[PDB]
């Protein structure tokens, strides 16, 4: 056991834009003239950047002696995630979590003559259910060889500090990965068009800058807070309302800096123009145009199932192995309001929602479907209804009425399609629903 | 013209609204603000915008 390295250059992995020594030597009268009087500048340029992989160096006076290490410093860091406030309790038993919502009905006018033969008719309540499952199971493994590591230090304090650094790093990695997973939740939600997108980069005024984004955020927060509710801010298209105290705004550092420099500075009474939700600051999003995300307190559905640590010792190899197991479920709820303030280019239509996602009809029954198109512009788009069951006699009317042929047995798929591209180059956004056959 | 077109238009809209509200509640009343053209009076605490 003797690991050695030979002829390691001082400049290992550096790519210099320009040669500092050559720039100092040449270019008389330039900005580099200040370093001309410095006699020992080449050595400073060579060494001050830093040295990777050192080698034994003999001192200049007596070649036999070797220069030694003067000072040893140990760097340690502690990290934690700022999104930990968005978690809930733990579930010890079970895997799947169910969520049920009930929407509102529709009004009918008073008709005594029609009420003669419709006393016992049925009106199915509008209910929607969705499920969350456990999806994260990981562990961190780290080994420590005390006896083999003892030769790299000459002081017990430094040895113990370096030993504890690994234990600290394990938990630092755990926290970092948890934060990354929580950010990935938002990124994945945006990647599927499930956010209600609002463009904040199109002012309508001659001087609309420095205020358009904050005006949009305040207006959207008020619209969410409106008591009568709306179906335009959730991916399930259900009539619901939120509250001002439950609205959380995940903001970008650049946008917060823009707000502080522009709005809050040159404006008295900052309470009349500050943000309305509870502001949480992150280091930007992975999406191209994402700038801010406004959600409800119930949007997050993060739970933890397991958090444990186990240690084993190898006595033949004289070392310790540490395993840190983390099991968690990470999910978001489609029943809560979710707005994405985006300052880039977005497609005209982001999604199409069919109100009954799952249906079960008989061989002679009929079903009614409703299509909600989420568009980023005031233009109105027309949906096209299609059925891909396969059996003859099954057709869907333009308004959204599906009828089933008398004799057939196969699962049916109902699609509402919206075309947003130009001619001879289709760009289709499709919303799908599934239908089963009762008999 | 357009309250969202410029900050001057919003100021003009505020001016017009305030002037109309002030002249609505004049003690002598007016008949220029109803479809029946009857001399009537409003009150400041009974005006909703």
Nearest CA among A197, A107, A128 for reference residue A354: A128
Nearest CA among A237, A250, A252 for reference residue A431: A237
Q: What are the helix (H) ranges across A192-287?
A: 212-225, 253-262
How does DSSP assign B4-49, residue by residue?
TT-HHHHHHHHHHHHHHHHHHT-TT-BSSSSTT---B---GGG---
Do B4 and A204 lie within an 8 Å CB cutoff?
Answer: yes
Chain B CB contacts of A206 under 8 Å are: 5-6
Q: Which two tokens stand for residue B46?
A: 């009974």
Element (H, E) at A375: strand A371-375
- Asked if A207 has any chain B CB less than 8 Å from its own CB, the reply is yes
| Reported resolution, Å | 3.0
Do B6 and A205 lie within an 8 Å CB cutoff?
Answer: yes
Q: Are A188 and A182 in contact (CB under 8 A)?
A: no
Do B4 and A205 lie within an 8 Å CB cutoff?
Answer: yes
Q: Which two tokens stand for residue A152?
A: 């790299």
How does DSSP assign A83-112, residue by residue?
GGGG---B--S-S-EEEEEE---------T
| Spatial separation of the C-alpha atoms in residues A211 and A171, rounded to whole Å | 42
Helices A212-225 and A253-262: angle between axes, nearest 10 degrees: 110
| Spatial separation of the C-alpha atoms in residues A108 and A282, rounded to whole Å | 49
Nearest CA among B2, B21, B26 for reference residue B13: B2
Q: Are A196 and A341 in contact (CB under 8 A)?
A: no
- Asked if B8 has any chain A CB less than 8 Å from its own CB, the reply is no
Chain A CB contacts of B5 under 8 Å are: 204-206
Shortest Cα distance, chain A CAs vs residue B8, angstroms = 11
Can you say whether the dihedral through the CA atoms of A257, A262, A264, A265 is positive or negative? positive
From which experimental method does this structure derive?
A: cryo-EM
Token pair 């959207």 is at which residue?
Answer: A220
Question: Looking at chain B, which residue has its C-alpha nearest residue A205?
Answer: B5
> Cα A390 to chain center, whole Å?
39
How does DSSP assign A312-326, residue by residue?
EEETTTTEEEEEEEE
Do B7 and A204 lie within an 8 Å CB cutoff?
Answer: no
- Residue A240 is classified by DSSP as B
């Amino acid at each position: 056991m003797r690991i050695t390295f030979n002829d390691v250059k001082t400049s290992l992995g550096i790519t210099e834009s320009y040669d500092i020594v050559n720039a100092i030597r040449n270019s008389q009268g330039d900005n580099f003239k200040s370093y001309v009087p410095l006699a020992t500048a080449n050595n400073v340029a060579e060494v001050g950047a830093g040295i990777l992989i050192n080698q034994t160096v003999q001192n200049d006076f007596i070649t036999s002696l070797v220069d030694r290490i003067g000072l040893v410093v140990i760097r340690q860091v502690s990290l934690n995630n700022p999104l930990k406030k968005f978690k809930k309790g733990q579930i010890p038993l079970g895997r799947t979590i169910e969520e049920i919502y009930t929407d509102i009905t529709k009004e009918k006018q008073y008709d005594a003559e029609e009420a003669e033969q419709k006393v016992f008719e049925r009106e199915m309540p509008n209910v929607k259910t969705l499920f969350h499952e456990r999806n994260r199971q990981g562990f961190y493994h780290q080994t420590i060889q005390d006896d083999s590591l003892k030769t790299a230090f000459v002081s017990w304090g430094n040895f113990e500090s370096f030993v504890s650094s690994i234990i600290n790093a394990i938990y630092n990695s755990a926290e970092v990965d948890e934060y990354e997973y929580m950010k990935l939740l938002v990124d994945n939600y945006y990647s599927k068009g499930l956010f209600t997108t609002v463009k904040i980069d199109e002012p309508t005024s001659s001087t609309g800058a420095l205020t358009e984004f904050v005006k949009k955020m305040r207006a959207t927060a008020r619209k969410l807070t409106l008591p009568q509710g709306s179906r335009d801010w959730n991916s399930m298209a259900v009539r619901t309302r939120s509250y001002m105290e439950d609205l959380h705004l995940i903001i970008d550092a650049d946008l917060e800096a823009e707000l502080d420099v522009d709005v809050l500075a040159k404006a008295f009474n900052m309470n009349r123009t500050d943000f309305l939700g509870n502001v949480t600051v992150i280091d930007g999003f992975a999406s191209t145009g994402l700038e801010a995300v406004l959600v409800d307190k119930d949007w997050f559905m993060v739970y933890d199932n397991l958090h444990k640590m186990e240690t084993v010792r190898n006595p033949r190899g004289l070392y310790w192995n540490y395993y840190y197991h983390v099991w968690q479920t990470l999910s978001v709820s489609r029943f809560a309001n979710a707005v994405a303030f985006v300052s880039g280019d977005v497609p005209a239509v982001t999604q199409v929602i069919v109100s009954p996602n799952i249906a079960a009809v008989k061989q002679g029954g009929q079903q009614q479907f409703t299509a909600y198109v989420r568009a980023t512009n005031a233009k109105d788009h027309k949906v096209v209804w299609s059925v891909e069951g396969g059996s003859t006699g099954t057709a869907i009317t333009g308004d959204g009425l599906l009828s089933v042929s008398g004799n057939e047995d196969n699962q049916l798929t109902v699609k509402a399609t919206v075309d947003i591209g130009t001619e001879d180059k289709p760009k289709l956004v499709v919303g799908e629903a599934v239908v089963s056959i009762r008999p």
